[PDB]
């Protein structure tokens, strides 16, 4: 039964065919359980396992490197040399990375908790039910409960399933629907049915939702839906259906891996095409086994050269340091990639109360009737000081302090605000300041009564805590609080029946004091109050009242008006049906207008400027509120979303309007609108769907499980620090202080990371690009192998890793919030940036190969060999006459490879300095700006010396120590990289920046 709320208690029992006395029979229990199923949310199956490791080895590039691991292992064992400990290093270090890199990708245990599993924490263990097999009540597993069961609930008990209330045994039943409403006010339930079939959950005054807990009372009911059919279940299935897409950067890195795969496979064939001359060679000259060794050892060496295998570890460390940086600015980011994608935030949908406002409710203005006489009508406006729940303030008329006790209308004003009120103030000892109890609105009314002091009670003689509820307590002494009529969303008001105490205060029998929506309550007023006297509610007066109501709500004041009326001669205690909620409408009719109070929900202290930041940063901001459209628009004008004087007719919508519009116009509305009022529960997710259709990275916010579906569906799920765990588990970011400013503060930081992160990306790939050029040149010309894969890996991991990670601490841009959000379809490298790191990379290939060739041909301590025979070194012992110098070990010497490797490290430290900025010269920004970069470079070069000196190392990398005679040549060939980059950067700022 889905629409059990719109059915009578007799109908729900007739449908399931159940007896309210004995309940379901064990025969029905099996039949219902087999038809509907167990009352429990489905445990998340199809989880991750060893298969999650397989997913890391799915990409094409990772398979290439994996194949390089297998090919390397094949060439390892099959060899003549007896290199013992330094043989299986090539296959070993490959697995070290393939293991480490795979562990980073499988890392989804400590940095992302499941939201649906956290949602299972709201379903209780056991529940009370009445089965026909026994007399007294019997509790069982909540999962054993079925639709039709006559369940029982009391105070403290957590509701097992969606229950249709049958009968309330206690005086009144209260339930804390905080998880499904957000408003932590214990709502009151009833037995009578709700006429609307498609009524919202808040309107369901006769339902007990699963996950909800009873705040007070005890009642018996019949189970309508169970498990996935419950309100919690319907929310769960929405989250289980929504698939979280990968951040735009992640898609580009995957897209890059595909491009780099084509590059490797292309050159592997290109190398084979260059050696097409071997097809025209004799059989009696060399062997296929000698050739394949060079081809295979080239492919594996070419694979590691192109791949930036150090990148993943570099970014993970950067984002990890980015997480601690964001948490300091009050922004608890959950997932690592979320810190980067946060800068790409295009839209921000935020809630008014709590986030945009301080939620420090306080009555600012209040007007009553001064006198009515024919066409003439005069009011009496006032103003209140003290933007807080504290009583420290005063009332004044027209910027002049007054005594509210001398105004009869204001006396009854405080009377209604005191009696018709469930909230109260409370002084705190720990913090040392007044606090609120109940609703924010009603607490402001309590504070107002304390400020007014209409009876002039003692004030200075009272203590701090004792006077917290002084004037209000004095008011409660006059009238007795018989009973209150609950606040319903259909009439939007609250009244209270009050009988006079044994005091004789001119009390004409019993009275009712009503408060609620101005436009609604004023209509139910046939009379009007003028001090002590009464007059008939005429047109001119009704205009003057509603006009001032509109002036306060639409004006710059942005006040939440609240009309206060009273029923002079209410019906007797007997005639009033105390249970009928719909009858509260006529019980609050024939009222007499007393006055009105205008309160303000003051905006945040920083939102005034934070909104302006979004305007300059090209980020759109969409407010979502519960206030009326007129005031919601006025509030937007005040904070900065709207201008003081501009069009907003089609840029602002209500929940009522948005539904009436067609599907296409709803999408057309979401692209321009930025202010939604009276939003329905399903609107947050709908709006996000329309924002995602425009490829806009959206950031929706929420606090309860009602928003969970919208949060998880959004790119950047924004949750409150005070929100429920389900919201914080479903959110990508959690605001620690619940502020829209800290929302933008994190967005600004996310952009800064994007710049510094993308900087060391082009830095590392630029390194790998030159490594490929070194292999392609040393292979095409047929030179002695310039570099070895065992070396390159340590170069990309440590040598390039330390400085690359240090580039994350680079200074930000002063004009970062001036540019618009980064486009999701924006590449890492393009056009000029491609050529720039292509030339810078292409040079290192000639630097490394040239450094090695330098030792072979024109060197100091090296054997003078010519270029034409140096390219045919593989024919060592064959062509003896041409090769007449030293042992064949000379071509396989450690010196030349050390020259190529040493040059690679030297230029990389220099290229790291070139990567301090994108185009800014080293003259403008010195290389000592980033302190962490210098420290990493000192450590990088320190490690470069260590692998050469400490004997246990140089034998492994096939390298030997270099003296000043050889090191001087390294600086001569390496340092020119800075001058080249300086020329390139100069061309960018001059003949390109336009
Ligand atoms: C982009 C943001 C991702 C977040 C985190 C926390 C980790 C990612 C970082 C991704 C690196 C991608 C690099 C592209 C190059 C081309 C690929 C390799 C060197 C691959 O090795 C050949 C290794 C891929 C590792 C990732 O799958 C692990 C991961 O989650 O890292
Ligand atoms: Na999400």
Curated annotation (Swiss-Prot):
Residues 1-48, 111-253, 314-757, 809-828, 918-930 are cytoplasmic. Its EC number is 7.2.2.10. It is found in: Endoplasmic reticulum membrane; Sarcoplasmic reticulum membrane. CDD domains: P-type_ATPase_SERCA. Disulfide bonds join 876-888. The chain crosses the membrane at residues 49-69, 90-110, 254-273, 296-313, 758-777, 788-808, 829-851, 898-917, 931-949, 965-985. Mg(2+) binds at residues 351, 353, 703. Keywords: ATP-binding, Calcium, Calcium transport, Disulfide bond, Endoplasmic reticulum, Ion transport, Magnesium, Membrane, Metal-binding, Nucleotide-binding, Phosphoprotein, Sarcoplasmic reticulum, Translocase, Transmembrane, Transmembrane helix, Transport. The modification Phosphoserine is found at residue 581. GO terms for molecular function: ATP binding; ATP hydrolysis activity; calcium ion binding; P-type calcium transporter activity. It is an enzyme of class 7 (translocase). GO terms for biological process: calcium ion import into sarcoplasmic reticulum; calcium ion transport; negative regulation of striated muscle contraction; positive regulation of ATPase-coupled calcium transmembrane transporter activity; positive regulation of calcium ion import into sarcoplasmic reticulum; positive regulation of cardiac muscle cell contraction; positive regulation of fast-twitch skeletal muscle fiber contraction; regulation of striated muscle contraction. Changing residue 789 to L: Almost complete loss of Ca(2+) transport activity because of reduced Ca(2+) affinity. Changing residue 876 to A: Loss of ATP-dependent Ca(2+)transport. The modification Phosphothreonine is found at residues 441, 569. Ca(2+) 1 binds at residues 304-305, 307, 309, 796, 800. ATP binds at residues 353, 442, 489, 515, 560, 625-627, 678, 684, 706. It catalyses: Ca(2+)(in) + ATP + H2O = Ca(2+)(out) + ADP + phosphate + H(+). Its cofactor is Mg(2+). It is a multi-pass membrane protein. Ca(2+) and ATP binding cause major rearrangements of the cytoplasmic and transmembrane domains. According to the E1-E2 model, Ca(2+) binding to the cytosolic domain of the pump in the high-affinity E1 conformation is followed by the ATP-dependent phosphorylation of the active site Asp, giving rise to E1P. A conformational change of the phosphoenzyme gives rise to the low-affinity E2P state that exposes the Ca(2+) ions to the lumenal side and promotes Ca(2+) release. Dephosphorylation of the active site Asp mediates the subsequent return to the E1 conformation. Key regulator of striated muscle performance by acting as the major Ca(2+) ATPase responsible for the reuptake of cytosolic Ca(2+) into the sarcoplasmic reticulum. Catalyzes the hydrolysis of ATP coupled with the translocation of calcium from the cytosol to the sarcoplasmic reticulum lumen. Contributes to calcium sequestration involved in muscular excitation/contraction. Interacts with sarcolipin (SLN). Interacts with phospholamban (PLN). Interacts with myoregulin (MRLN). Interacts with DWORF. Interacts with VMP1. This is Sarcoplasmic/endoplasmic reticulum calcium ATPase 1. It comes from Oryctolagus cuniculus. The gene is ATP2A1.
């Amino acid at each position: 039964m889905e629409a059990a709320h719109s059915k009578s208690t007799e109908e729900c029992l007739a449908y399931f065919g159940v007896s309210e006395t004995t309940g379901l029979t064990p025969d029905q229990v099996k039949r219902h359980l087999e038809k509907y199923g167990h009352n429990e949310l489905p445990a998340e199956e199809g989880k991750s396992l060893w298969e999650l490791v397989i997913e890391q080895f799915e990409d094409l590039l990772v398979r290439i490197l994996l194949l390089a691991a297998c090919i390397s292992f094949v060439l390892a064992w099959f060899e003549e040399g007896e290199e013992t400990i330094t043989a299986f290093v090539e296959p070993f270090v490959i697995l070290l990375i393939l293991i480490a890199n795979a562990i980073v990708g499988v890392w989804q245990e400590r940095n992302a908790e499941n939201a649906i599993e956290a949602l299972k924490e709201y379903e209780p263990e056991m529940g009370k039910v009445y089965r026909a097999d026994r007399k007294s009540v019997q509790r069982i597993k909540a999962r054993d409960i079925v639709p039709g069961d006559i369940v029982e609930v009391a105070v403290g008990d957590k509701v097992p399933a969606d229950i249709r209330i049958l009968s309330i045994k206690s005086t009144t039943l209260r339930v804390d629907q905080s998880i499904l409403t957000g408003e932590s006010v214990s709502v009151i339930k009833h037995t009578e049915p709700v006429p609307d079939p498609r009524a919202v959950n808040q309107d369901k005054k006769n339902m007990l939702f699963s996950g909800t807990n009873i705040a007070a009372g005890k009642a018996l009911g019949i189970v309508a839906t169970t498990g996935v059919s419950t309100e919690i279940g319907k929310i769960r299935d929405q989250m289980a259906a929504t698939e979280q897409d990968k951040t735009p950067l992640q898609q580009k890195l995957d897209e890059f891996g595909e491009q780099l795969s084509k590059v490797i496979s292309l050159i592997c064939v290109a190398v084979w095409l260059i050696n097409i001359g071997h097809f025209n060679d004799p059989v009696h000259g060399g062997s296929w086994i000698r050739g394949a060794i060079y081809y295979f050892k080239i492919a594996v060496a070419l694979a590691v050269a192109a791949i930036p295998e150090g990148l993943p570890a570099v970014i993970t460390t950067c984002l990890a340091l980015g997480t601690r940086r964001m948490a300091k600015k009050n922004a608890i980011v959950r997932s690592l990639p979320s810190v980067e994608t946060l800068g790409c935030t295009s839209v921000i949908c935020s809630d008014k109360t709590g986030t945009l406002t301080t939620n420090q409710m306080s009555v600012c203005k209040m007007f009553i009737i001064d006198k009515v006489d024919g066409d003439f009508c005069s009011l009496n406006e006032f103003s209140i000081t003290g933007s807080t729940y504290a009583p420290e303030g005063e009332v004044l008329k027209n910027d002049k302090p007054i005594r509210s006790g001398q105004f009869d209308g204001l006396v009854e004003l405080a009377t209604i605000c005191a009696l018709c009120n469930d909230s109260s103030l409370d002084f705190n000892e720990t913090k040392g300041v007044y606090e609120k109890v109940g609703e924010a609105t009603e607490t402001a009314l309590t504070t107002l009564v304390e400020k007014m002091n209409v009876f002039n009670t003692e004030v200075r003689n009272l203590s701090k805590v004792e006077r917290a509820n002084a004037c209000n307590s004095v008011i409660r002494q006059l009238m007795k609080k018989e009973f209150t009529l609950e606040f319903s969303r259909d009439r939007k008001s609250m009244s209270v029946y009050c009988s006079p105490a044994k005091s004789s205060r001119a009390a004409v029998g019993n009275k009712m004091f009503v408060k609620g929506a101005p436009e609604g309550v004023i209509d139910r007023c046939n009379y009007v109050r003028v001090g002590t006297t009464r007059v008939p509610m005429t047109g001119p007066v009704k205009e003057k009242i509603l006009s001032v109501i509109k002036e306060w709500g639409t004006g710059r004041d942005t006040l939440r008006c609240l009309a206060l009326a009273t029923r002079d001669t209410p019906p007797k205690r007997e005639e009033m049906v105390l249970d009928d909620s719909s009858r509260f409408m006529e019980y609050e009719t024939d009222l007499t207008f007393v006055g009105v109070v205008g309160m303000l929900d003051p905006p945040r202290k920083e939102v005034m400027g934070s909104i302006q930041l979004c305007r300059d940063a090209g980020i759109r901001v969409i407010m979502i509120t519960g206030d009326n459209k007129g005031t919601a628009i006025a509030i937007c004008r005040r904070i900065g979303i709207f201008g003081e004087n501009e069009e907003v007719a089609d840029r602002a919508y209500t929940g009522r309007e948005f539904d009436d519009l067609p599907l296409a116009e709803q999408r057309e509305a979401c692209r321009r609108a930025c202010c939604f009022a009276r939003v329905e529960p399903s609107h947050k997710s709908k709006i996000v769907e329309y924002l995602q259709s425009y490829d806009e990275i959206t950031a929706m916010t929420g606090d309860g499980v009602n928003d969970a579906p919208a949060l998880k569906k959004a790119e950047i799920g924004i949750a409150m620090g005070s929100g429920t765990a389900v919201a914080k588990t479903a959110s990508e970011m959690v605001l620690a202080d619940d502020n829209f400013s800290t929302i933008v503060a994190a967005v600004e930081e996310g952009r800064a990371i994007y710049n510094n992160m993308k900087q060391f990306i082009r830095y590392l790939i630029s390194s790998n690009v030159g490594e490929v050029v070194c292999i392609f040149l040393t292979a095409a010309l047929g030179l002695p192998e310039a570099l070895i894969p065992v070396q390159l890996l340590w170069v990309n991991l440590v040598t390039d890793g330390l400085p690359a990670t240090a580039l994350g601490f680079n200074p930000p841009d002063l004009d970062i919030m001036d540019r618009p959000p980064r486009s999701p379809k924006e590449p890492l490298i393009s056009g000029w940036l491609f050529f720039r790191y292509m030339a810078i990379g292409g040079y290192v290939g000639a630097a490394t190969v040239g450094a090695a060739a330098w030792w072979f041909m024109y060197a100091e301590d090296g054997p003078g060999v010519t270029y034409h025979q140096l390219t045919h070194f593989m024919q060592c012992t064959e062509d003896h006459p041409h090769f007449e110098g030293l042992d064949c070990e000379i071509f396989e010497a450690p010196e030349p490879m050390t020259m190529a490797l040493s040059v690679l490290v030297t230029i990389e430290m220099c290229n790291a300095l070139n990567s301090l900025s994108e185009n800014q010269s080293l003259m403008r920004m010195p290389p000592w700006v980033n302190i962490w970069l210098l420290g990493s470079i000192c450590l990088s070069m320190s490690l470069h010396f260590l692998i050469l000196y400490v004997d246990p190392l140089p034998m492994i990398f096939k390298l030997k120590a270099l003296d000043l005679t050889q090191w001087l040549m390294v600086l001569k060939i390496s340092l020119p990289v800075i001058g080249l980059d300086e020329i390139l950067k100069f061309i960018a700022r001059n003949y390109l920046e336009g």
